[PDB]
Amino acid sequence: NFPNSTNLPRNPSMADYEARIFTFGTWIYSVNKEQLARAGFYALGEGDKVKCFHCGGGLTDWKPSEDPWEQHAKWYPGCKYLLEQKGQEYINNIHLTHSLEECLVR
Numbered sequence: 099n100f101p102n103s104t105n106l107p108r109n110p111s112m113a114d115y116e117a118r119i120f121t122f123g124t125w126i127y128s129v130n131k132e133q134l135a136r137a138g139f140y141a142l143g144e145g146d147k148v149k150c151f152h153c154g155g156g157l158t159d160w161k162p163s164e165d166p167w168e169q170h171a172k173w174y175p176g177c178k179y180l181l182e183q184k185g186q187e188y189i190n191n192i193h194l195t196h197s198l199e200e201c202l203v204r
């Protein structure tokens with residue numbers, strides 16, 4: 099299913115931070131859940147799979163080193179929530195970084 103790039107969220111029931119934070123429960127995984135919720139992610143109950151309330155973007159198999167906002171921007175750069183909370187400059191920083199990380203090896 100394609101990512102949502104409209105200014106309207108795909109899952110408006112998860113639009114409030116408090117709604118999202120309730121989805122995790124006891125969270126054993128490597129990335130802090132409050133951080134995941136602030137980046138707009140709620141939990142699916144399927145290991146450490148999160149989905150963005152706005153773009154619907156899904157992310158799984160999180161490493162301890164990884165940042166929710168960075169991961170959000172890498173995989174779901176079209177997201178209007180991300181663009182609202184972080185601004186296009188941040189997004190360009192993140193993408194230049196990830197594209198330069200890729201090239202410093204491949």
Ligand SMILES: O=C(CN1CC[NH2+]CC1)N1CCCCC1
Pocket residue numbers: 156157158159160161164169173
């Ligand atoms: O899991 C990912 C990408 N990363 C893997 C490492 N941990 C953070 C997310 N996705 C799944 C959905 C399609 C794009 C790739």
Ligand SMILES: [Zn+2]
Pocket residue numbers: 138150151152153154155170174177178179180
């Ligand atoms: Zn999003």
